[PDB]
Structure 1
Amino acid sequence: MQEQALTELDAEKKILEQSRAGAQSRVDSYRALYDENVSAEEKRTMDL
């Protein structure tokens, strides 16, 4: 039974790694949004 108690934590690691992947995807999305402040075309409309 102790081995099942030990492999449940190896499933918990999979849970937290999927959470880590989702948060990394949000960081990679919002850093791309934040670096491109205004687009190349949002500058064109201010010029217009």
Structure 2
Amino acid sequence: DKVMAEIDADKLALQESRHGAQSRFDSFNTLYDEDVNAGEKQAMDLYL
């Protein structure tokens, strides 16, 4: 029974690893979706 409970708690540890990998993926994905920012394109306009 305690062996099976150890398997359960290890599953919870891997799920909380997956949550952090998902947060990184969503954050770098929304960073990659915008090429430049509004102010960054504004600065390009100003240099031009």
Q: TM-score range by the shorter chain?
A: over 0.9
* Aligned residues: CA RMSD: 0.5
1:9 aligns with 2:7: yes
Q: How many residues align?
A: 46
TM-score, normalized by length of structure 2? Answer: 0.92
TM-score, normalized by length of structure 1? Answer: 0.92
Runs (4+) off by over 4 Å:
none
| Unaligned ranges ≥5, structure 2 | none
Higher helix proportion: 2
| Unaligned ranges ≥5, structure 1 | none
Alpha-carbon distance, 1:41 to partner: 1.0
